[PDB]
Design a protein around this ligand. Structure first.
Ligand SMILES: O=C1N=c2cc([N+](=O)[O-])c([N+](=O)[O-])cc2=NC1=O
Length: 257
């Protein structure tokens, strides 16, 4: 039985309100829950869904060189495959294999409805409306290392802005936009930005185009016998229109706005 590590992030993987009554993979529902079943069918294997221990994605500590999150659980042999919204990145692909992307995304701007901002440039040309990112991770580094005039101007601003414009978690950034009366814009992944746009009280919105291009991939350890079939199944699913169907289902059909 294939051990599948995943993370509790809406609407990818959630607990059914009556999870105690059920057991097995029946306790969960969501985009990745459905995706897992499909990948399992097209690769001919049995699996058990497990929630990543530390509830993280996967980063390598700079001093200890230890991997945490789902990537960690793969390189340390505790899981056979990772099916979740795990961004495909260089540092992670050095230690594990990524399938072709099953969903596209990018850094985007979230604003409280009515906020007079329509693009990253709009943000860079003022200070009345503060804006920031997660105090650590991909999106922060993007601005810190960008050579682009507008992004570099945004970085210089965020660097020294007071009060600090960085948040410890994604939920904190979203709440900050909702409770700042339009004086705070949050920079986060487009997929999460658009999900939140479809949730009550429907006071947020995604504006402007993506600042970059990324993708979520399914991960397997190096040398995994699953690697090949997983890759083909993701392509077949997308070619048959199922991935787009799956996203519309969890983002829109189940939307509240
Ligand atoms: O691997 C990653 N996957 C993520 C997936 C999501 N998500 O949207 O599912 C978010 N987000 O919530 O901002 C951040 C993430 N950061 C990462 O490092």
């Amino acid at each position: 039985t294939v051990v599948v590590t995943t993370i509790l992030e809406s609407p990818y993987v959630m607990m059914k309100k009556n999870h105690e009554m059920l057991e097995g993979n029946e306790r969960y529902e969501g985009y990745c829950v459905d995706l897992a079943a499909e990948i399992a069918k097209h690769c001919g294997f049995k699996y058990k869904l497990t929630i990543v221990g530390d509830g993280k994605y996967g980063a390598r500590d700079a001093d200890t060189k230890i991997w945490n999150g789902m990537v960690g659980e793969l390189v340390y042999g505790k899981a056979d495959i990772a099916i979740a919204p795990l961004t495909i990145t260089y540092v992670r692909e050095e230690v594990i294999d990524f399938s072709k992307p099953f969903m596209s995304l990018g850094i985007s701007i979230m604003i409280k409805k009515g906020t007079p901002i329509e693009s990253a440039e709009d943000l860079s040309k003022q200070t009345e409306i503060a804006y920031g990112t997660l105090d650590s991770g991909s999106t922060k580094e993007f601005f810190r290392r960008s050579k682009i005039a507008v992004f570099d101007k945004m970085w210089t601003y965020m660097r020294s802005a007071e009060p600090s414009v960085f948040v410890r978690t994604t939920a904190e950034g979203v709440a900050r936009v909702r409770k700042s009366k339009g004086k705070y814009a949050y920079l986060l992944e487009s997929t999460m930005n658009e999900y939140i746009e479809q949730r009550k009280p429907c006071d947020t919105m995604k504006v402007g185009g993506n600042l970059d291009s990324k993708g979520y991939g399914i991960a397997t350890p190096k040398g995994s016998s699953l690697g090949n079939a997983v890759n083909l199944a993701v392509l077949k699913l997308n070619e048959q229109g199922l991935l787009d169907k799956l996203k519309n289902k969890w983002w829109y059909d189940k939307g509240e706005c």
